[PDB]
Amino acid sequence: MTLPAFKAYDIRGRVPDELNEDLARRIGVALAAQLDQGPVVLGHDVRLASPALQEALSAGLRASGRDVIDIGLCGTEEVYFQTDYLKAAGGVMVTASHNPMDYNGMKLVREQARPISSDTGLFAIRDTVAADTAAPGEPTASEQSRTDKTAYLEHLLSYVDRSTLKPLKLVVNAGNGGAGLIVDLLAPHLPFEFVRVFHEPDGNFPNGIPNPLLPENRDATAKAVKDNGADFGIAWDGDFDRCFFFDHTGRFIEGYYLVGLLAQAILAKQPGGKVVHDPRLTWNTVEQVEEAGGIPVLCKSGHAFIKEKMRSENAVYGGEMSAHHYFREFAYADSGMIPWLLIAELVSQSGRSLADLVEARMQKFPCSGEINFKVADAKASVARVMEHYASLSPELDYTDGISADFGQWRFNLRSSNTEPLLRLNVETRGDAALLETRTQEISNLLRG
Numbered sequence: 001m002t003l004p005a006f007k008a009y010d011i012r013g014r015v016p017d018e019l020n021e022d023l024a025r026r027i028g029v030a031l032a033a034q035l036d037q038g039p040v041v042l043g044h045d046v047r048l049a050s051p052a053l054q055e056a057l058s059a060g061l062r063a064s065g066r067d068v069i070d071i072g073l074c075g076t077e078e079v080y081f082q083t084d085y086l087k088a089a090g091g092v093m094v095t096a097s098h099n100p101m102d103y104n105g106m107k108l109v110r111e112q113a114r115p116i117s118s119d120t121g122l123f124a125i126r127d128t129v130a131a132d133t134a135a136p137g138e139p140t141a142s143e144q145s146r147t148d149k150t151a152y153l154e155h156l157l158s159y160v161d162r163s164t165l166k167p168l169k170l171v172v173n174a175g176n177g178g179a180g181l182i183v184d185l186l187a188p189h190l191p192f193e194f195v196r197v198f199h200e201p202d203g204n205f206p207n208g209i210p211n212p213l214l215p216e217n218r219d220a221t222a223k224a225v226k227d228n229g230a231d232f233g234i235a236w237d238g239d240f241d242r243c244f245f246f247d248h249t250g251r252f253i254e255g256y257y258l259v260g261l262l263a264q265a266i267l268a269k270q271p272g273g274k275v276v277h278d279p280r281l282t283w284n285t286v287e288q289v290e291e292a293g294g295i296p297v298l299c300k301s302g303h304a305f306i307k308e309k310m311r312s313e314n315a316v317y318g319g320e321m322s323a324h325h326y327f328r329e330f331a332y333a334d335s336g337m338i339p340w341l342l343i344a345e346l347v348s349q350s351g352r353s354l355a356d357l358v359e360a361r362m363q364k365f366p367c368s369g370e371i372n373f374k375v376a377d378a379k380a381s382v383a384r385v386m387e388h389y390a391s392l393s394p395e396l397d398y399t400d401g402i403s404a405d406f407g408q409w410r411f412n413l414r415s416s417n418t419e420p421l422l423r424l425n426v427e428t429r430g431d432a433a434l435l436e437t438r439t440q441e442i443s444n445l446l447r448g
């Protein structure tokens, strides 16, 4: 077989059987042979095993003659930012993001923080690691510790006009991951009052693993917003490359609507720019991008596809409905910090609540949310769906699975590249009843 920890976009596995210090060291050796010239940035998250896995990575990199730049405990986006900012050959973030306690992993990038994925180097690394029985060499290169976050913080702050910000009251929920460190370093430069929930980094995760999609974790943010009269609330996953928004009523905002909202926010600063979006939910983004003077660019979902499309298009912003937001000026990379700064600025400047900024969009393009199906035969299930709707002659698009546009409603149905699942998204033109009947109809067909 092959090493299970090597996935489509990253490395992730249970410690110590699927990922351990020996494997991490061998990954460092193999990575050194895949990169162009230069040093390698290393960072890690709050998980208990992350520092030791980073040290083993560093040992393998330095045995292969790579200088290492240790940026310490950080978010994934800080590895992306520093890899690009320091003109490094590449970077590795040690993180399991939102996964259980016994899991860890790595996200690997090359120059300019360009992703290393299964077909762009990661499986080559896997195959090298799988066959490597060489004795570990000794270091022929040095490690320097570079924990200064000043350039990163200045970059985050550059997205907003600080003189226009109002002293909004914001709930922030790090979930005992790493986001609270950055919030606290940004706070002296912002007028906001923060209400800090689950703020201290703790890799034991006493309040649950950092996954703001779990309703129990969602509710801690919502309750803090409502009980404190906060303008809005923000929650992050453990490595804070995803952020999640709660309006002043405590309502969790479906990530679809943030794409159009952030696109409009960015297009105010970068007029006429291109905006990359995924095919799962589209109508609202296309309309909001066009009405702000931007050009929407459809792209298959998946961060590596999004980033490569943004680069080819000089796109100013890309967004996925799955709480991933990418910014050209940020090495084309995703940040869980830039989005809430932009939203706080939009609320401050417009005088509108986050709820009202999205309410009419949610009414105009209601959506199912992503619904996941584990079925006995995904291919046969998809065929049952398409056969049922054939007589209606939908307009079909194969950018990312199957998209079917029926006029007043549409759906996307695709296999996940990170899990053995089918994922369904449905939206309609202002018709909640049609949304429900079609969603239920498709669901019955998938489960047939």
Ligand SMILES: O=P(O)(O)O[C@H]1O[C@H](CO)[C@@H](O)[C@H](O)[C@H]1O
Binding pocket: 009, 301, 302, 303, 304, 320, 322, 324, 415, 416, 417, 418, 419, 423
């Ligand atoms: O499993 P999927 O749906 O193929 O991919 C999922 O993880 C990717 C990396 O986080 C994201 O870029 C996708 O938007 C998300 O849907």
Ligand SMILES: [Mg+2]
Binding pocket: 097, 098, 237, 238, 239, 240, 241, 242
């Ligand atoms: Mg994450």
